[PDB]
Enzyme design. Structure first.
Site, mmCIF file in Angstrom:
data_model
loop_
_atom_site.group_PDB
_atom_site.id
_atom_site.type_symbol
_atom_site.label_atom_id
_atom_site.label_comp_id
_atom_site.label_asym_id
_atom_site.label_seq_id
_atom_site.Cartn_x
_atom_site.Cartn_y
_atom_site.Cartn_z
ATOM 1 N N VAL A 26 0.825 -1.198 0.000
ATOM 2 C CA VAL A 26 0.000 0.000 0.000
ATOM 3 C C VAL A 26 0.875 1.271 0.000
ATOM 4 C CG1 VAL A 26 -0.540 0.511 2.506
ATOM 5 C CG2 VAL A 26 -2.404 0.603 0.753
ATOM 6 N N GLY A 27 2.136 1.125 -0.402
ATOM 7 C CA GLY A 27 3.043 2.269 -0.490
ATOM 8 C C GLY A 27 4.509 1.898 -0.515
ATOM 9 N N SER A 28 5.348 2.837 -0.957
ATOM 10 C CA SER A 28 6.805 2.694 -0.848
ATOM 11 C C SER A 28 7.499 4.028 -0.533
ATOM 12 C CB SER A 28 7.404 2.043 -2.110
ATOM 13 O OG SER A 28 7.621 0.648 -1.925
ATOM 14 N N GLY A 29 11.050 4.230 4.308
ATOM 15 C CA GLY A 29 10.488 2.883 4.172
ATOM 16 C C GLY A 29 9.201 2.632 3.351
ATOM 17 N N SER A 30 8.966 1.343 3.056
ATOM 18 C CA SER A 30 7.735 0.833 2.423
ATOM 19 C C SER A 30 6.740 0.330 3.492
ATOM 20 C CB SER A 30 8.084 -0.316 1.482
ATOM 21 O OG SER A 30 8.899 -1.250 2.169
ATOM 22 N N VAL A 31 5.495 0.110 3.086
ATOM 23 C CA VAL A 31 4.417 -0.207 4.014
ATOM 24 C C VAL A 31 3.506 -1.273 3.425
ATOM 25 C CG1 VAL A 31 2.327 0.625 5.181
ATOM 26 C CG2 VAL A 31 4.375 2.065 5.182
ATOM 27 N N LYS A 46 5.122 -1.078 8.599
ATOM 28 C CA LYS A 46 6.224 -0.315 7.999
ATOM 29 C C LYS A 46 7.565 -0.997 8.201
ATOM 30 C CE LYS A 46 8.250 4.398 7.532
ATOM 31 N NZ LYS A 46 8.401 5.827 8.031
ATOM 32 N N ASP A 161 2.553 10.631 10.069
ATOM 33 C CA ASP A 161 3.581 11.245 9.246
ATOM 34 C C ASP A 161 4.129 10.216 8.242
ATOM 35 O OD1 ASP A 161 5.476 12.964 8.105
ATOM 36 O OD2 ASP A 161 6.460 13.512 9.985
HETATM 37 C C1 LIG Z 1 4.750 11.577 16.127
HETATM 38 C C2 LIG Z 1 4.507 12.123 14.713
HETATM 39 C C3 LIG Z 1 4.696 13.639 14.740
HETATM 40 C C4 LIG Z 1 3.025 11.934 14.389
HETATM 41 C C5 LIG Z 1 5.381 11.324 13.748
HETATM 42 C C6 LIG Z 1 5.033 10.073 13.212
HETATM 43 C C7 LIG Z 1 5.974 9.497 12.353
HETATM 44 N N1 LIG Z 1 5.804 8.286 11.753
HETATM 45 C C8 LIG Z 1 4.734 7.692 11.158
HETATM 46 O O1 LIG Z 1 3.592 8.367 10.964
HETATM 47 N N2 LIG Z 1 4.829 6.445 10.795
HETATM 48 C C9 LIG Z 1 4.045 5.672 9.984
HETATM 49 C C10 LIG Z 1 3.420 6.270 8.871
HETATM 50 C C11 LIG Z 1 2.607 5.539 8.001
HETATM 51 C C12 LIG Z 1 2.426 4.174 8.236
HETATM 52 C C13 LIG Z 1 3.042 3.542 9.330
HETATM 53 C C14 LIG Z 1 2.806 2.172 9.496
HETATM 54 C C15 LIG Z 1 3.391 1.504 10.577
HETATM 55 C C16 LIG Z 1 4.205 2.224 11.461
HETATM 56 C C17 LIG Z 1 4.424 3.597 11.279
HETATM 57 C C18 LIG Z 1 3.852 4.291 10.207
HETATM 58 C C19 LIG Z 1 7.125 10.308 12.190
HETATM 59 N N3 LIG Z 1 8.244 10.096 11.436
HETATM 60 C C20 LIG Z 1 9.479 10.853 11.752
HETATM 61 C C21 LIG Z 1 9.984 11.768 10.616
HETATM 62 S S1 LIG Z 1 10.323 10.894 9.183
HETATM 63 O O2 LIG Z 1 11.650 9.894 9.539
HETATM 64 O O3 LIG Z 1 10.562 11.714 7.691
HETATM 65 C C22 LIG Z 1 8.795 10.124 8.964
HETATM 66 C C23 LIG Z 1 8.161 9.381 10.156
HETATM 67 S S2 LIG Z 1 6.942 11.773 13.125
#
Ligand SMILES: CC(C)(C)c1cc(NC(=O)Nc2cccc3ccccc23)c(N2CCS(=O)(=O)CC2)s1
Ligand SMILES: CCCCCCCCO[C@@H]1O[C@H](CO)[C@@H](O)[C@H](O)[C@H]1O
Length: 332
Positions: A26-28, A29-31, A46, A161
């Site tokens: 469902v996307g490309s 880390g990849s998921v 992820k 995010d």
């Molecule tokens: C706490 C806050 C502000 C909401 C953040 C969340 C995340 N990560 C997140 O939403 N993870 C996931 C997204 C989509 C599917 C997933 C599926 C499984 C697990 C995680 C998943 C952050 N980061 C850091 C910066 S970065 O390294 O450019 C990108 C990711 S910051």
């Protein structure tokens, strides 16, 4: 230790506990999406791309694991599970994060469902509520946009995010301020709210400077009070130079909208980040009266982010990350 199985999906190799069944991408880390047979829920998996490739990646891996492990709030993404195929620090080179598969993002919704004023209150209320929490841990999201907003069948919302962003970015960022405060996320919320009310992108610039231009015609040229905080002569001239478009007035861009909605928008889309309304104050705004409740809008536990002002070697970032995986405790 659970038994793992191996699978290649879109030329990417996945290595998961047997617990996670039916991997579909469902996307490309990849998921991937999978069925957690432990709970009968669909989850998102992820798998970090090249997690410890350089010092920067390795820190970014540790960061993202720390962030997720901390977020314990209803309007924010939480960690259901993190695992690795590795039996040991020495073998350790892949990291997988698991979270609740939320139905669809705010973009998918707006496309084929046309929001009520009641929908906007509940949705924006939830972002705000998630942010008060976020901001309380001294974390700044920085990339709020409808693709980072998950919404279930009950129009209930989580912030996440997925790593165009620019339409919702605060202008101080598009001018490169280095300082940045938390209300950049409030600018993004006002760009998101705007679009929910109008059904159109508020600042659709062809490039960053065209967007700065449309930002400035609506909100207005910086007032003396603001230009007074800009140390740079060249910065002070350039902002006056981009504020040459014919002035557009706010309340005539938002004509059919609830008057309280327009009021709130006027308080989020303030050019001077210092005078922009915060998440906590916003929640008390009369536009959210059907929903606001101050005994149910918590702040976060202390978040130790001393690691952020640290320069360590790859193997140190890796060993730290490996400790965070081993020590993980799931929610019940
Ligand atoms: C706490 C806050 C502000 C909401 C953040 C969340 C995340 N990560 C997140 O939403 N993870 C996931 C997204 C989509 C599917 C997933 C599926 C499984 C697990 C995680 C998943 C952050 N980061 C850091 C910066 S970065 O390294 O450019 C990108 C990711 S910051
Ligand atoms: C093109 C629009 C002009 C951009 C000027 C917007 C001013 C935003 O606000 C500024 O942001 C900084 C964030 O680090 C704060 O430290 C400043 O004190 C604040 O006034």
């Amino acid at each position: 230790r659970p038994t793992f199985y191996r699978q290649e999906l879109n030329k990417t190799i996945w290595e998961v506990p047997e617990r996670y069944q039916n991997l579909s991408p469902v996307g490309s880390g990849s998921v991937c999406a999978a069925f957690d047979t432990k709970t009968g829920h669909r989850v998102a998996v992820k798998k970090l791309s090249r997690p410890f490739q350089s010092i920067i990646h390795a820190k970014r891996t540790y960061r993202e694991l720390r962030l997720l492990k901390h977020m314990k709030h209803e309007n924010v993404i939480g960690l259901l599970d993190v695992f690795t195929p590795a039996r040991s620090l020495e073998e350790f080179n892949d990291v997988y994060l698991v979270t609740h598969l939320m139905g669809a993002d705010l973009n998918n919704i707006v496309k084929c469902q046309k929001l009520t004023d009641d929908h906007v209150q509940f949705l924006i209320y939830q972002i705000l509520r998630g942010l008060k929490y976020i901001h309380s841990a001294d974390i700044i999201h920085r990339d709020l946009k409808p693709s980072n907003l998950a919404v279930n069948e009950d129009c209930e919302l989580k912030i996440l995010d997925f790593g165009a962003t620019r339409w919702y970015r605060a202008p101080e960022i598009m001018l490169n301020w280095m300082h940045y405060n938390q209300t950049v996320d409030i600018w993004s919320v006002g760009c998101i709210m705007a679009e929910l009310l109008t059904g159109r992108t508020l600042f659709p610039g062809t490039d960053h400077i065209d967007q700065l231009k449309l930002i400035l015609r609506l909100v207005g040229t910086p007032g003396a009070e603001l230009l007074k905080k800009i140390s740079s002569e060249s910065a002070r001239n350039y902002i006056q130079s981009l504020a040459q478009m014919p002035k557009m007035n706010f309340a005539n861009v938002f004509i059919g909208a609830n008057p309280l909605a327009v009021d709130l928008l006027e308080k989020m889309l303030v050019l001077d980040s210092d005078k922009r309304i915060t998440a906590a104050q916003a929640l008390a705004h009369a536009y959210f009266a059907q929903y606001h409740d101050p005994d149910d809008e918590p702040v976060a536990d202390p978040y130790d982010q001393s690691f952020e002002s640290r320069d360590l070697l790859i193997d140190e970032w890796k060993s730290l990350t490996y400790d965070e995986v081993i020590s993980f405790v799931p929610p019940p």
